[PDB]
Amino acid sequence: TKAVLSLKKPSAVIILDNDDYSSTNKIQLKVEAYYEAKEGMLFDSLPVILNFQVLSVS
Amino acid sequence: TTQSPLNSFYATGTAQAVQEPIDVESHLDNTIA
Numbered sequence: 634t635k636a637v638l639s640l641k642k643p644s645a646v647i648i649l650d651n652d653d654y655s656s657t658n659k660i661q662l663k664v665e666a667y668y669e670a671k672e673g674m675l676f677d678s679l680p681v682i683l684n685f686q687v688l689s690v691s
Numbered sequence: 692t693t694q695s696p697l698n699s700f701y702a703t704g705t706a707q708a709v710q711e712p713i714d715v716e717s718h719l720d721n722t723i724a
């Protein structure tokens with residue numbers, strides 16, 4: 634597990650190295666969610682968006 | 692985006708009372724003579 638994101642601390646920095654790059658060409662990362670919904674609120678078709686930015690490569 | 696009050700639930704019964712507690716019938720069939 635590399636990072637935990639939340640509504641109060643939305644940003645995190647992770648590192649991928651030689652051990653992560655299996656098959657020498659790709660990284661696989663699944664997402665795990667924990668939540669509690671507001672009381673008496675009904676809705677549908679609400680998107681959740683994540684963004685990626687590269688800081689350094691070598 | 693709808694906010695619900697969460698109080699739209701009900702259950703109903705009934706009651707009645709359509710008669711008096713007692714009924715009285717007389718059989719005084721003798722004469723003081």
Ligand SMILES: [Ca+2]
Nearest residue numbers: 688689690691
């Ligand atoms: Ca560089």
Ligand SMILES: [Ca+2]
Nearest residue numbers: 710711713714
């Ligand atoms: Ca009666």
